[PDB]
Symmetry: C3
Subunit: 31 residues, 3 copies
């Protein structure tokens, strides 16, 4: 349970960083 | 358990939206 | 529990593929 919460959080962190990288790419492809 | 399922689903939703944004960027960088 | 671990892993896999696609876009927007 605690390790599963850990694993969920590792995913949440990866998502957070992906969102920020995507946002950078979005800006660079934008007019 | 139910809240953990919730949290997993919040991640799944964030991923879904990231995938669609990535796809938009992929198209805009494509020839 | 086992299915929840499954679901977490489905998210981890989606994230992995998103990270690689983002990286491709990052390179294509880079100088
Ligand atoms: Cl997750
Ligand atoms: Cl992207
Ligand atoms: Cl993601």
């Amino acid at each position: 349970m605690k390790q599963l919460e850990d694993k969920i959080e590792e995913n949440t962190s990866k998502i957070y960083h992906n969102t920020n990288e995507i946002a950078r790419n979005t800006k660079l492809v934008g007019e």
